[PDB]
């Protein structure tokens, strides 16, 4: 199967030395082959895995021949194609459907909240930085960008240490200021709140950069005419800058929504196992995105290593392909 796929990739056959569209693709193939092998292929494999029963009991394909009827049935056959069985079992089971719906709702809420907060903070910072009456604007840009420059995992683990409960830094700072113990990791609500705070802290500088670029794209004569008419700063922001930014900002908002939906690295590094749902056949926590739910079913030892259920392709990648279509429609706009 891998050999046939590689042979297809090699002898696509459009390299005929005819100076036709063959020449044009002779430039695209390098890298198009790279994508077809390194991006599309894992996706198609994930599609294929779902229809099978790949698990910790069926991980081996056929190598076990001896290691009578010799259990020559279906389940002892290890890798077999079930067919929509894993897709149905994510809904009809009701032992994994309710956790699935809960984490789906949490993921949507988390992504929407963090996108709105990030857009607002970045837009405000950009508008304030481009005042042209401030001092040390380069210093301010550097300082407000520093979270982007710091490697992501370093900041996430720093926040993990700071929000600790057993010893704690932020917690005992808060106790010294006014004695309260937030209990970030123990309480699911406080865990989600810290999660939103950390995601906003990580994501604000990027949208700040995008809004700074868009304000550069914005001309200054409109501002000057508003100043002639008598408009102030807030009136300018609310009736000049904002209407001309949401129209080119909607695709960026949608893309950031998708990124915050699949923030596996953040949710895995910080409170990977936020308080468990206490009654789930598959392991699942309150602060679990869909991606890390599937990761938990896939590789966490307590989940049984059910790779077939761990696919969940037709949910995650299908909402994701809806997102692709929406942003693509918005990109061709104007």
């Amino acid at each position: 199967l891998f050999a046939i796929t590689t042979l297809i990739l090699s002898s696509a056959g459009l390299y005929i030395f005819a100076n036709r569209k063959a020449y044009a693709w002779r430039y695209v193939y390098p890298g198009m082959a790279g994508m077809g092998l390194f991006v599309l292929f894992p996706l198609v494999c994930t599609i294929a895995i779902a229809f099978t029963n790949y698990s910790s009991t069926n991980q081996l394909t056929f190598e076990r021949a001896q290691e009578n009827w010799g259990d020559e049935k279906l389940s002892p056959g290890y890798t077999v194609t079930t067919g929509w069985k894993n897709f149905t079992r994510v809904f009809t089971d009701e032992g994994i459907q309710k956790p699935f719906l809960a984490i789906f709702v949490w993921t949507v809420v988390f992504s929407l909240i963090t996108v709105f907060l990030t857009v607002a903070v970045g837009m405000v910072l950009a508008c304030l930085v481009q005042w042209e009456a401030l001092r040390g604007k380069a210093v301010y840009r550097v300082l407000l960008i520093l979270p982007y420059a710091v490697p992501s995992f370093i900041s996430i683990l720093i926040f993990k240490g700071l929000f600790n409960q057993s010893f704690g830094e932020i917690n005992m700072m808060l106790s010294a200021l006014f004695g309260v113990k937030p209990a970030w990791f123990s309480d699911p609500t406080t865990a989600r709140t810290m999660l939103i705070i950390v995601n906003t802290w990580l994501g604000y500088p990027y949208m700040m950069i995008l809004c700074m670029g868009l304000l550069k794209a914005i001309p200054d004569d409109l501002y000057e005419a508003s100043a002639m008419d008598g408009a102030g700063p807030f009136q300018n922001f609310f009736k000049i800058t904002l209407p001309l930014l949401i129209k080119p900002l909607t695709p960026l908002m949608i893309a950031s929504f998708a990124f915050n939906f699949n923030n596996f690295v953040l949710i895995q590094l910080l409170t990977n196992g936020g308080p468990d749902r206490l009654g789930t056949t598959t392991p699942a926590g309150y602060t679990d995105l869909l991606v890390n739910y599937t990761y938990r079913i896939a590789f966490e030892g307590g989940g049984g290593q059910d790779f077939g259920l761990a696919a969940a392709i037709a949910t995650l990648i299908f909402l994701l392909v809806g997102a692709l279509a929406i942003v693509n429609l918005k990109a061709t706009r104007m």
Binding site: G31, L128, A133, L143, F153, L157, A258, N262
Partner: protein, 286 residues
């Protein structure tokens, strides 16, 4: 220099105060991780920003010395330099592959034209803004099946890491195509007029003009490779073979939480911060 009312000074004071407060709030975590690095103890508590400068964690994280505190010597916790070396190798190979695979696609998508251009660009966007969403299961199964055939790209090896990392071509082709669009569109036509075959027109005219954007892409993808976590964490198991961002998790473990050593390693990772600050930002008009 528009003539402005007396409210301008009040607005400026308010803006300066708000920005200073916001930057203090933002820099609190980084200043706190810096101060923790100089703390003698590794379990924190005590004083919030100790005045003493122990430096024992730095030398542990450097591995220069064991930092004798009591009679018993303290061996280095983890080989952070080994982490760095593995991360550097993986990032270098991934960046080289990304640039080599992406430059020609960027040329094809930006400068020349072909009948399937619209569909190819739409598919490029479509499969570009995918993240590593469930592809980890497929990669794990594929590497499990492949390691018996070719070990050097199988499991618990850098081959799988680099193979997963080459996907960034979809992301970088857009930056390189934007630069190609920025470059004047009459250059290839003029070169064809002087008698240059289009391959020579690319190689001699536009390819040397791609050096700045290629360097920027190389740096950006090198950083994205050095700071990757998911795939390396999933399919890296041997203790010696760990890259960066994967032993950092072992620094913070419920059996032994290590603030000082973790912070020493974190501030040892200050170089990517400066690199992304200056080279990645490229001092473009923002």
């Amino acid at each position: 220099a528009m003539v402005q009312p007396k409210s301008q000074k009040a607005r400026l004071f308010i803006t300066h105060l708000l920005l200073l407060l916001f930057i203090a709030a933002i820099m609190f975590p980084l200043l706190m991780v810096v101060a923790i690095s100089l703390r003698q103890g590794n379990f924190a508590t005590g004083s919030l920003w100790p005045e003493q400068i122990s430096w024992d964690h730095w030398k542990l994280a450097l591995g220069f010395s064991v930092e004798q505190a009591d009679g018993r010597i303290w061996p280095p916790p983890f080989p952070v330099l080994l982490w760095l070396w593995n991360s550097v190798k993986v990032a270098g190979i991934s960046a080289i592959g990304i640039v080599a695979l992406s430059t020609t696609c960027a040329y094809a998508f930006a400068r020349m034209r072909f009948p399937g251009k619209a569909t190819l660009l739409k598919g490029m966007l479509i499969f570009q803004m995918f993240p590593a969403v469930l592809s980890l299961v497929a990669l794990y199964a594929l590497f499990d099946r492949l390691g018996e055939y070719i070990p050097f790209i199988g499991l618990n090896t850098h081959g799988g890491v680099i193979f997963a990392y080459l996907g960034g071509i979809a992301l970088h082709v857009w930056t390189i195509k934007g630069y190609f669009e920025t470059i004047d569109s009459s250059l290839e036509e003029a070169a064809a007029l002087d008698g240059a075959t289009p391959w020579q027109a690319f190689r001699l005219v536009l390819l040397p003009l791609s050096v700045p954007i290629l360097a920027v892409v190389f740096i950006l993808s090198f950083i994205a490779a050095i700071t990757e976590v998911p795939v390396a964490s999933l399919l890296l198991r041997d203790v010696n073979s760990y890259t960066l961002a994967v032993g950092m998790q072992q620094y913070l473990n419920p059996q032994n939480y290590l603030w000082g050593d973790f912070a020493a390693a974190a501030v040892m990772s200050a170089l990517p911060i400066t690199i992304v600050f200056l080279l990645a930002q490229r001092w473009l008009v923002n």
